[PDB]
Amino acid sequence: SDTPVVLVTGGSRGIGAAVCRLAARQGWRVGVNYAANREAADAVVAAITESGGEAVAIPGDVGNAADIAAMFSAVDRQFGRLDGLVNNAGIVDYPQRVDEMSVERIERMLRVNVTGSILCAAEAVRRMSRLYSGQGGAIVNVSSMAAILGSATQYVDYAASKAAIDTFTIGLAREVAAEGIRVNAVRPGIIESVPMQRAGMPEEVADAILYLLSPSASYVTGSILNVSGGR
Amino acid sequence: TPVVLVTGGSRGIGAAVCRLAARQGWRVGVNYAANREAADAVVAAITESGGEAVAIPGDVGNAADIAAMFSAVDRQFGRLDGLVNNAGIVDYPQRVDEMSVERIERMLRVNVTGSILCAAEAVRRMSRLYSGQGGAIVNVSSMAAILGSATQYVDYAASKAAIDTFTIGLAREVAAEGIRVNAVRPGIIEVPMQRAGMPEEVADAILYLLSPSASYVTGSILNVSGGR
User: Fold this and answer.
1) Which of A114, A163, A173 sits opposite B164 (nearest CB)?
2) Is the CB of residue B90 less than 8 Å away from at least one CB of chain A?
3) Which fold is adopted by the domain A1-231?
4) Where does the record place a coiled coil (chain A) (predicted)?
């Protein structure tokens, strides 16, 4: 009731699942969003509830604007409030040169990674803003070291899409800082040329995301934290 | 004689780039997205000065228009040495929580996909992978990519940061094939210097990046902002 609520998009696997589990362990109620596979989601919900946590599976593909509104509606119905958003759902594609990419590929990359995250952030701002009788909240977007490195000969489209998330983070953060919403991002590197000599674990990305979501980051907004082992 | 296609060449920075490129000895394709009259006037002023230019229709936000814009270049001039990705849109100032999906989708299709598809066409012609002889691409970004455009068009800012990283990644992708790719970030165009920039000053930077005096510069993004 007075327990804060986080929606995690793409919460069924990998980083998103590690975020959901960690958030519940730190006392959040968790909206576990999945786009295609209800069983995978129910398994994350199960690990949380088994552990004494609170979570609900929420269906919706962030590449679909109608689904976004519905997923936020389901949050309203199930929990009554919204205190955090983790924009983790997104896609990569198979390696291609730019001069081989179809318009359909690029359009989807931008729709899912950029528009999906902007629309989810908008829904969260409408609910958490002190301008609208909210009590403030936090958003963490998931970017990628690709935003810095460029992904040459693999998916420059993906890298561009994540750079758009970096500046979306910076501009939204300055836009809604006074209204009690913090907005930050993380840039995961290689997650299961890296100075630490290994891939990172999804749990290590989650640790950073929950930090930036938490009240121990009360003066942090508009920041983008690399989680990349030095890459 | 080198050839440059300038997208959105009708007005503003794009028309300044066309005029200066012709003054510096380039043949110029002056692309226009809708009504042709302003592009025709840019062409006539180039023509009457003794330059060579043609007005080429095509909206970069329509993927179906892009191939024919580059074919027109091919037929008119028989080669392509430069591309300036200048076509772009802004929208009316709104908060992110006020924007429609239509607005966001269109900002990305025009400013990002449009520039990516035009660069692909240029790469297909210029790359030494396909017997081209190399070339240069300049993308037009904006200081918004750094500053965020809070309360006005965060969406536009995100679209131009996308351009920044597109510039970096594509540069690295085609560097060995004889193609250079750079961007400019214009600030307030007609501030520490206490004045807006002129279109011509942005054109000056873009021509520099398209020139052989930038032969080791690729993957760089040059601010043209008066200190902003």
Assistant:
1) A163
2) no
3) Rossmann fold (3.40.50)
4) none
